[PDB]
Amino acid sequence: GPHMAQFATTVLPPIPANSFQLESDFRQLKSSPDMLYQYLKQIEPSLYPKLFQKNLDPDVFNQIVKILHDFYIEKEKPLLIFEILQRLSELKRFDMAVMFMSETEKKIARALFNHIDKSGLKDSSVEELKKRYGG
C-alpha cells in the first residue's frame, strides 16, 4: 500500500557451502531484495561455478538477475554484473533455468546486457550472453 509494511528482524546469513544452502537463503530473502544485494556482495564469482556444480535452480537464476537489475547497476560496476552472468552460463542446468523464465524475467536479463553495453563494455561475449539468457 501507500505506507511501508512491518518487516521481520533479519541479518545477512553466512556464505553457503553449496547450492542447497544458497537457494535456501535466496528463497527466504526473495521478498527482501535490498538485503539480497548485500548477501550477493559477500559471494565472489569464484564461488558461483562451485556452489552450482551439481545443479542450478530456475528461481535462483531469475533472482540473481533480478537483484543485478536494480542494485548492481546502481551500486556496483557494470563489469561485475557481466562477470556474474558469465559464471552462471557455464552451469549444466543454466539453459533449463532460461526455459523456465518468462518474458517478465527475460526483459530483466536483457536490461543487464543493455546497461553493460552502453557503459562502454564491448566484447563478443556481451552479445552471446544476452542471447543465451533471452535472445
UniProtKB/Swiss-Prot annotation:
- The superkingdom of the source organism is Eukaryota
Q: Which family does it belong to?
A: Belongs to the RPAP3 family.
Which gene underlies this protein?
Answer: RPAP3
Oligomer status and interactors: Tightly associated with the RNA polymerase II complex. Component of the R2TP complex composed at least of RUVBL1, RUVBL2, RPAP3 and PIHD1. Component of the PAQosome complex which is responsible for the biogenesis of several protein complexes and which consists of R2TP complex members RUVBL1, RUVBL2, RPAP3 and PIH1D1, URI complex members PFDN2, PFDN6, PDRG1, UXT and URI1 as well as ASDURF, POLR2E and DNAAF10/WDR92. Interacts with PIH1D1. Interacts with TSC1 and TSC2. Interacts with PRPF8 and EFTUD2 in a ZNHIT2-dependent manner.
Q: What is this protein called?
A: RNA polymerase II-associated protein 3
Taxonomy-wise, where does this protein's organism fall, top ranks first?
Eukaryota, Metazoa, Chordata, Craniata, Vertebrata
Q: What does this protein do?
A: Forms an interface between the RNA polymerase II enzyme and chaperone/scaffolding protein, suggesting that it is required to connect RNA polymerase II to regulators of protein complex formation.
